[PDB]
């Protein structure tokens, strides 16, 4: 029972920055789950944006320096949260952004290969139009 | 006819010290067939070590022994008052058995 | 002739050791435990033999030279005027060393064979 | 230029204690191949000590376990703890049993809890306790100690020989010295897998149906100087003893519950005489003479025999069992110093018995209908030496019991369990 | 609880013979315990005299023919006994004689090597002056 | 498959012996007894194989010549007409002899190899 | 020590595969069951080793060529930049293949040896 | 929620009334142990802790 809830549609102008939040109902902790942020252009195929895993954050080469990923674990009155911040938006960033959460606890499982991973659960996707 | 000799014929130490006593044999005893005894004045000798490095029931853990070929060593740690008198050294690999000349401690 | 060579010299006892090797409803708890323990002991001895490359042999030869500090007796004296029990009592303090040496020698042999066949 | 060589199958053993298989013919002893095989070990001298042998503890535990497992499923006699109204028996319809049997009337529960039945039984006076100093109010001996279970009708009380077989990796060494006394070196040793058949016969003062010494009488004790240590005397010529109960009992049953049946003695049909054991006086005289002569070798004083000093019925009189009847015989004609012809010893029968102290709590032995007649061989005597004062000119030996382990130490004294260590390392010119 | 009790001091003249006894309280039998008799001259080291083991008596080369060792086992009134008999005494035999017992039951024990043995228990010793 | 080619001739049966060789929480007392007995049977078979110098093999050749009194039939008749059950029944009276000779031959081989290495 | 090579590369771990090999009264039902299961696991591993001709060996070479569809990786990358767990995870899907191949090879060898001994 | 501390707090609990244990035989070999009497102090049992 893993439900990922995301923020709503945001319409922005070039030069600004945006933040997308994903709440992971059912995820006990992000120490045993990895959060992968991916992109889908309007009519193109999915693109990998970034990853938080074992409390380490990383991004692809095309996104280094302008994309920042953070996360906070289970609290008293909120599930685990993952946040994606995009700086210096341009007209090419209009797309639907997805959070995916993949289990990591089973070391012999086939859903992950040394950091690069499958995407077992998906959020409803947030539309960002610039 | 193995003849065993002890070098430190006389020793002196204080309470809490550590004492080493050495025996040298005319032949190598590969079976570690060596025993260590203690004798206080006016009393019968007491056996403390057999097979070079084996203790007996009631003998304190302070006493220890090492064996190698012709060289055998008795080590006494945290020396107390009761550990006084003449220490003797015996072999029983060949017949007859033979004792050392004894070393005086305290 | 099980244990029949106990009082014989090792020169004659070493001949035909395979007698010892051959000899080596609702059930009670004790019977089942005894059977399991016997199986475990046999497997432990076989594990020791297999570590040294002596898996299916009774008279197995090795490549570890005999250190004279383990025992300095002559070959004739060992194999002509003593029994197995006395000999095993005499060298009791070095069995653990000899076991480790045999294991290391076997490992070195395996690695060297691998390297030689690599060439 | 010598190299290590490994030998598997070296004949080297070490003293060890393990569990041994039980052979015959939770707990079970039913292998059926006791076929023995013996191998002498030449030029081997082995140290034996019968008083530090684990086989006796194993046999103790096995016999206790078998006794408890046999009595597990059959009848419990908890309703019998009822106040009994006991009067003198009427048997009108060396000596008679009118002073030992009491006619007791009581109430018992039927298979329906709402109705009780008034019944009667003939009980022996040794199994009853009087509640008031002058009255007819009586109870059973065990009602203040434990709960008794009836000896189930299908249980057979005769002993069966038991062989003990060492598992793989072990062996049983046997000392064949013909004058062995249980401790010391043995120069003629053999090796076996299974011991000879041993019957778990229970007795107190005289060892029965046992093996005989090969050469001469053997005196065995843990410590001769300690007067608290029992002395086992093993004979080389058994003495035949025949015990009988001439009374004809009636085994009558009362239904005391839903499927629980209690067997009792209805009446003594005829031949009102006490049970007795017959023995030959001359053979006993010769055996006692030989025992005295042998014991002269250890004690340098005149040797006399006296009856047990005191105690209860259990620790004073010769207890044994056969046909399922439990006899306590008064051995005072023996062990008292005309001995001509036949010696007749009186005996009393008990039904509530506690064979093993604290084991099984107690057992009720049902009676047997016919006349019981039974024979046995005396092959050993257990004695105890009274503590002297250093001034008497003679030593007094009394027949005494004690631990039942002594009844089995006399059969397992020549056995030892050893562990094989088949892994040798020797210097050899091979490479 | 092996207590070895020996006889008292004796003063003798040259040419005579002496007997020294040793009572072994706590020793069950001499079939499992070996008895060793040793000598200690005043101000010198211990010297081995003889032994009885498995009911076989032996003496060293320096004492053959003039020392006789005997022993009897446990009896009804006294513990096991061992005894030295010394013939043709000379002025050099004045010394303290010690009776020792060592267990031989365990064949694998390190207290004995095929007859030549260590001495686990010691008696109080008898002073003999000639 | 397992016990397949049981009705086939021994020539065809010997081709694929490995197919048959490969197959060779309170549990309950009977399950424990069955497991222990299976382990014991496997170890007994392995002990017999290792006594003859065939510890880890399916087909093992030995140095014991075939006595014609054990069976005097032709090679073709054995390996092209009968099955394994018939053959094993035919020579059932000589199995113990052959086992003893195999053990003796292995022992002689070991001792002779040791003597040769000594030289 | 035991398992201490985990986390190191396979080149360094392959030279210490002896510690793991060396380290691989009413008792109660659970203890007895555990003992029997441990014996069973050891014997199963030994059975697989025996089917391939590596009964008493730790490092054993075979005649089965390495298919590139199994790994397709460089020798230095395998033995210098990976650990044993990663390697075993990568090639899991093919293990049951390779095992079978090994068995077949051994069988072939034996039969060929028999032919080479009949000539 | 499990809260695991790094510094233990010592607590000492006592019952100061002197109980008299007696025995009643309720069957064959079956013995029942009861509180025969209450003597000494009669204060309630309590635990002591440092504030
Ligand atoms: C159990 O237990 C366990 C243990 O024991 C635990 O765990 C834990 O958990 C936690 C949680 O809860 C955690 O924490 C967390 O963490 C995380 C991570 O981080 C990381 O990362 C980051 C990032 O990185 C990146 O970037 C950078 C920049 O510079 C760089 O450098 C790097 O390298 C990287 O980079 C990369 O990548 C990128 C992308 O991503 C790209 O681009 C590039 O190129 C590259 O590639 C970082 O930063 C960090 O760091 C930090 O830390 C460290 C440590 O060591 C240090 O050292 C450093 O220095 C730093 O520090 C800093 O910070 C900190 C924090 O903050 C502080 O404190 C300090 O002071 C300083 O300042 C790392 O590495 C993270 O992310 C997080 O954070 C969060 O939270 C916090 C709290 O406080 C805060 O502060 C922050 O801010 C954040 O918040 C945010 O987010 C959230 C989420 O959701 C949200 O909600 C909020 O609201 C916020 O938001 C905001 O802000 C943001 C910012 O950005 C923005 O954007 C937005 O918009 C808004 O506004 C945290 O920190 C931990 O760690 C753990 N531990 C361990 C040991 O690990 C658990 O939990 C338990 N459990 C239970 C149940 O309890
Ligand atoms: C269980 O069982 C078991 C079995 O089964 C048992 O065991 C047993 O035991 C017993 C005891 O108890 C025993 O007996 C004993 O023994 C011992 C030992 O002996 C041995 O030895 C000896 C010695 O030798 C040496 O010497 C010689 C001289 O000639 C020579 O020859 C040799 O060789 C050696 O030499 C070497 O060494 C030395 C040193 O020592 C040197 O010097 C040199 O040079 C060289 O080197 C001998 O003698 C002996 O002999 C004998 O024996 C044999 C056998 O076979 C014979 O053959 C011979 O002949 C002889 O005999 C004769 O004698 C006898 C006696 O001896 C008689 O009996 C006869 O009959 C005849 O006559 C051996 O070999 C011993 O020692 C001991 O003795 C003792 O005792 C007795 C009793 O009776 C008497 O008699 C004697 O006399 C003695 O006595 C003494 O001692 C004691 C101690 O304590 C004392 O007390 C007394 O008092 C006396 O003293 C006195 O005298 C002396 C004299 O000497 C003097 O000196 C002093 O001073 C005083 O006066 C015994 O015999 C046995 O044996 C065993 N068995 C077996 C089998 O082993 C057990 O016991 C059981 N258990 C229970 C619990 O019961
Ligand atoms: C020392 O050793 C002796 C010798 O073994 C023991 O004495 C024997 O004890 C056994 C058991 O108590 C006696 O066997 C019993 O005999 C009863 C009487 O036998 C009559 O009936 C048979 C029927 O064929 C006749 O052959 C015989 O001549 C008599 O006329 C039997 O009734 C008993 O039967 C029981 O056992 C059978 C076994 O199959 C059961 O099926 C029955 O249902 C029944 O339960 C039994 O056979 C034997 O007679 C005694 N021998 C002698 C010579 O007296 C000593 O008891 C022993 N001492 C001890 C143990 O202290
Ligand atoms: C830990 O406990 C919390 C709270 O008890 C659990 O959170 C609950 O998670 C379930 C499913 O993960 C949520 O149900 C879903 O909610 C979404 C919200 O949009 C809805 O769309 C779905 O149809 C479904 O109903 C539930 O709302 C949520 N409750 C709260 C208060 O957050 C959490 O799952 C527990 N974690 C574990 C590992 O057990
Ligand atoms: C067999 O029984 C006898 C007698 O019960 C035991 O003899 C007793 O042995 C103990 C110690 O061995 C003796 O105690 C010691 O006596 C000496 C005598 O001088 C004394 O100095 C010590 O302080 C200590 O008290 C005891 O006296 C002795 N009893 C008799 C009557 O002689 C013997 O030990 C028993 N043997 C075995 C193997 O158990
Ligand atoms: C040689 O080995 C023997 C026995 O293997 C050692 O003797 C043991 O010493 C320990 C020390 O506490 C005792 O607990 C054992 O009881 C002794 N064994 C026996 C059979 O008595 C001896 O110490 C070893 N000697 C050397 C020099 O290594
Ligand atoms: C125990 O039994 C005796 C005998 O059956 C009882 O004594 C009889 O009591 C009745 C009634 O009082 C008399 O008529 C008889 O004469 C008595 N018989 C004798 C021989 O005296 C006695 O009452 C019974 N007691 C209990 C407690 O049941
Ligand atoms: C034991 O006592 C009981 C009762 O006191 C006797 O049973 C009675 O015996 C007479 C004999 O004439 C019968 O008429 C009665 O019917 C019996 N009573 C019952 C209730 O059946 C019994 O006979 C006595 N037994 C002995 C051996 O004295
Ligand atoms: C049973 O043992 C006794 C030992 O007490 C034997 O009696 C001795 O026999 C020898 C034989 O020559 C005589 O010299 C002794 O005098 C006898 N001693 C006594 C006290 O009688 C007896 O012969 C043995 N019987 C059998 C059948 O072996
Ligand atoms: C065992 O029988 C003996 C006699 O064979 C009994 O002892 C006799 O007891 C009477 C009276 O109590 C005395 O007058 C005799 O002097 C005793 N004789 C002897 C030799 O002691 C003994 O009481 C019987 N034991 C039991 C328990 O009945
Ligand atoms: C239980 O007994 C202990 C000690 O026997 C008591 O603890 C200490 O008691 C002494 C009195 O001699 C005081 O001086 C200490 O201050 C006590 N230690 C503390 C309070 O930590 C303890 O008080 C007794 N139990 C109770 C409930 O009083
Ligand atoms: C026992 O020793 C004698 C010594 O004469 C020897 O002849 C005999 O062969 C030995 N026994 C065995 C079984 O070796
Ligand atoms: C015993 O019973 C008989 C008949 O069974 C009877 O004649 C006699 O009076 C009775 N005696 C006693 C004392 O009960
Ligand atoms: C040893 O005992 C056996 C027992 O049958 C006997 O046959 C043999 O002669 C005895 N040997 C000696 C040397 O006493
Ligand atoms: C059974 O016999 C036939 C002969 O017609 C043969 O073809 C077939 O292969 C045999 N079965 C097997 C399993 O070999
Ligand atoms: C762990 O990795 C480091 C890398 O610097 C290496 O030096 C070390 O040997 C590794 N640990 C082991 C046990 O090999």
Residue numbers in the entry:
A (entry chain A), E (entry chain H): 0 to 129
B (entry chain L): 0 to 105
C (entry chain S), F (entry chain R), G (entry chain T): 521 to 544, 569 to 663
D (entry chain Y): 33 to 57, 71 to 138, 147 to 309, 312 to 320, 320A, 321 to 353, 356 to 393, 409 to 502
H (entry chain Z): 284 to 309, 312 to 320, 320A, 321 to 335
Give sentences from the paper.
While the primary way out of the HIV-1 epidemic is an effective vaccine, the development of such preventives is marked by frequent setbacks, largely due to the inherently high mutation rates of HIV-1 genomes and the immune evasion capacity of the viral envelope glycoprotein (Env), which is the sole target of host humoral immune response and thus the focus of HIV-1 vaccine design. Despite its essential role in mediating HIV-1 host entry, most antigenic surfaces on Env are either hypervariable or cloaked by an evolving glycan shield. Here, we present the cryo-EM structures of Envs from two Asia prevalent CRFs (CRF01_AE and CRF07_BC) at 3.0 and 3.5 Å. We also solve a 4.1 Å cryo-EM structure of CRF01_AE Env in complex with F6, the first bNAb from CRF01_AE-infected individuals.
To overcome Env metastability and create stable, homogeneous Env trimers for structural studies, uncleaved prefusion-optimized (UFO) design was applied to these two Env sequences, generating X18 UFO (CRF01_AE Env) and X16 UFO (CRF07_BC Env). We complexed X18 UFO and X16 UFO with bNAb 8ANC195 to further stabilize the Env trimers in prefusion state and determined their cryo-EM structures at 3.0 Å and 3.5 Å, respectively. The overall structures of X18 UFO and X16 UFO adopt closed trimeric conformation in prefusion state, and closely resemble the Env structures of representative strains BG505 (subtype A), JRFL (subtype B), 16055 (subtype C) and X1193.c1 (subtype G). Here, the FP of X18 UFO (also from CRF01_AE) did not recapitulate the ‘buried’ intermediate state seen in T/F100 SOSIP trimer, possibly due that the UFO trimer is not cleaved between gp120 and gp41 as in SOSIP trimer. There are 29~30 potential N-linked glycosylation sites (PNGS) in each protomer of X18 or X16, we observed 18-20 of them in the cryo-EM structures and confirmed the existence of other PNGS, most of which locate in or near the structurally invisible variable loops, through mass spectrometry analysis. Together, the structure and MS analysis identified 30 of the 30 PNGS in each protomer of X18 Env and 24 of the 29 PNGS in X16 Env. Of note, the V1 of X18 (CRF01_AE) is glycosylated at 6 different sites, making it the most heavily glycosylated V1 among the five strains (compared to 2~3 such sites in other strains). Moreover, the V1s of X18 (CRF01_AE) and X16 (CRF07_BC) are significantly longer than those of strains BG505 (subtype A), JRFL (subtype B) and 16055 (subtype C). We found that the affinities between X18 and PGT121 (V3 bNAb), PG9 (Apex bNAb) or VRC01 (CD4bs bNAb) are all obviously lower than those between other Envs and these bNAbs. In contrast, the interactions between X18 and interface bNAbs 8ANC195, 35O22 or FP bNAb ACS202 are all close to average as compared to other Envs.
